[PDB]
Structures are given as C-alpha cells and as structure tokens.
C-alpha cells in the first residue's frame, strides 16, 4: 500500500470538540497494532 | 505505582459518579497502549476521566 | 512487563540504590542531580522512595532543594510519608522542610502517614508546628482516612494534638459517619466521648444515628445524654 493525501491543512485546523475527538481517533488507529513497515503514506500541503 | 494516588480518585468521584468505571481504565490502558509510557500514572487516569 | 521507571541514569540508579555509582556520577557532573525527567522529579525523591539514608543524606549535605515538585505537585516529604521511613522523614524535618507543601489534591503529607498508618512519621511531622486542622481541596483532614481506614491509634495520637473534630467535609459527611460507615464501636464511642457534634447533618441530610446499623447510634446517643 502507499497512501496519497493532498491539502491536509484543511483537517488539520462541541464544534470543535467533535474534530478533537476525530484526532483521537486517527491516534488510537495510527499508535494501535499495525505493521507501518510494508504501508506507505505521503502527506501533501500547503503552510 | 506510587504516584498514582488513592486519594484524589476515592474522593473527585464521590462527588461526580460515571458510569463503567473498569471500562474507563481499560480506556486509560488504551491511553498507556501508546508505548509513551511504561507504567500507567495518574496522568492517564484523570485524562482518561475528564474525556468520558 | 518491568524496567527503568524513568529515562535519566541518575533516577534509576536513585531507585536501584546504588551509593558508588551515583556518587560517582555527582563527582563526575554536578549538574546530574538539577536535570529534570518526563515525571518532573529527580534523584532525590526516588532516592526517598528506595529508603536510603545514606542517600539522601548525602543529597541533603549538598543542599539540594526540597520545595521541588512535580507537575503533580508531589513533594519528597510525601513520598517520605508513603513509604513509611522514619529515617527520611527525621533528614527532611530535620533540613526544615515545609510541612504545608500541598499536592495536586492538596493533601498534606499527614494523611498519607494517617492512610500508610505510620505513627511515628505523623508525631514528627506534627512536631514540626504542622496544622492538624489543614484542609485539602477537597476539604477534608486526615481524620477521616484514619477512622475510614479503622485506626484507633491513628486518631488517638491525632488527638494528642487537640485536633478538632469539627471540621466539615464538602460533602458534608464528619470523620463520625465515617467512623459509622466503618462500622467501629470503640472509634465512635470514643470522638462521641470527646465532645463530637451529632447534630450536623449532610447534603443527604442524614444523622449520624441512621448513618450506623445495629443500633449503633442509639448507644451513641446514650453517650451523648449520659
């Protein structure tokens, strides 16, 4: 697998409390079992 | 481990009771999962409270 | 699984209580022992939590501050007091250490020595000029961990002191319901006998009477009219 991501600037940035929870959960799945040595990602963006 | 105090945690839910209590430490084992950390602290647990 | 409980060398070797090694590694850098972990503690208060005198004596004749806290706010004194050593406690009162260092709950050291159930270490620390009557964030002394904990002797000791009784909880619940709640006849009987009000009520509004079973309170009562 590669992974392409362009503009990721957008994502980055109770309103707020629901994206705070979605990081939560991109953390919990990226620090969770998984084997990253095979698995590629690419991150695209802006500032 | 000894930092983890007793205390705090026999006393702050007295007054504000959750639900799932074991469910909210395997929650904060899932906090200590994140190989940051080797042994759980009082850190994980009130974090792990004040989210849910 | 086990290991190192803290990334710095000087730390661990605190904890693992080697006295030529780290010796050794002060003679070598004297800026060994001002360095900080991720915890926000150095060697000393591992070196208190080992139970080393030579130690932390050691420590103490350089003149290591003891006010330093972590981001939780623990001071040595605390782990001295959990650890049960008398020993570090006479070096850290003997430094003048201040007994109204307060954690991140605000509990003073004394209900740590009340909840360990150490005599000695609370007799020294109240020694010290400590206030007894000190209230933590939580607006609670160390009196209701010791009649909690079911400690006779703990209150005892703490009432050799003259300690009031009549500090209210934020809760609303007195070192007496918890006295009842524990189910101890000779704890309730006794700060029945030295002069405890029955007459305040919690945010429950529950006497003290219903708070016992077994017609605890009743006998309670008879104390309190006779």
Avoid at chain 3, 19 to 30: G, H, Y
Avoid at chain 3, 177 to 189: I, P, Q, S, Y
Wanted: hydrophobic share 40%; glycine share 8%; charged share 25%.
């Amino acid at each position: 697998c590669i992974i392409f991501m362009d503009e990721i600037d957008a994502i980055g940035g109770s309103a707020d409390r629901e994206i705070q929870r979605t990081l939560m959960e991109l953390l919990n799945q990226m620090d969770g079992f998984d084997t990253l040595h095979r698995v590629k990602m690419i991150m695209a963006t802006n500032r | 481990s000894e930092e983890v105090d007793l205390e705090d945690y026999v006393a702050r839910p007295d007054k504000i009771s959750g639900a799932d209590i074991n469910s909210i430490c395997q929650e904060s084992g899932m906090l200590a999962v994140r190989e940051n950390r080797y042994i759980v602290l009082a850190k994980d647990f009130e974090k792990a409270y004040k989210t849910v | 699984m086990e290991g190192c409980v803290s990334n710095l060398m000087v730390c661990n070797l605190a904890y693992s209580g080697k006295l030529e090694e780290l010796k050794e590694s002060i003679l070598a850098d004297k800026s060994l022992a001002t360095r900080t972990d991720q915890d926000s503690r150095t060697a000393l208060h591992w070196a208190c939590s080992a139970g080393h005198t030579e130690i932390v004596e050691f420590l103490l004749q350089l003149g290591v501050p003891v006010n330093d806290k972590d981001d939780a706010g623990w001071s040595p004194l605390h782990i001295a007091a959990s650890a049960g050593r008398d020993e570090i406690v006479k070096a850290l009162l003997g430094k003048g250490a201040q007994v109204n260092a307060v954690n991140q709950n605000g509990c003073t050291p004394l209900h740590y020595a009340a909840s360990k159930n150490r005599h000695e270490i609370a007799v020294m620390l109240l020694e010290g000029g400590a206030n007894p009557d000190a209230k933590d964030h939580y607006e609670a002394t160390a009196m209701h961990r010791a009649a909690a904990k079911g400690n006779l002797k703990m209150i005892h000791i703490l009432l050799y002191y003259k300690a009031s009784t009549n500090i209210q909880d934020t809760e609303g619940n007195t070192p007496l319901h918890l006295a009842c709640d524990e189910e101890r006849v000779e704890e309730a009987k006794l700060l029945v006998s030295q002069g405890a009000s029955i007459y305040i009520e919690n945010k429950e509004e529950k006497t003290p009477l219903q708070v016992a079973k077994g017609g605890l309170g009743l006998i309670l009562k008879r104390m309190v009219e006779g």
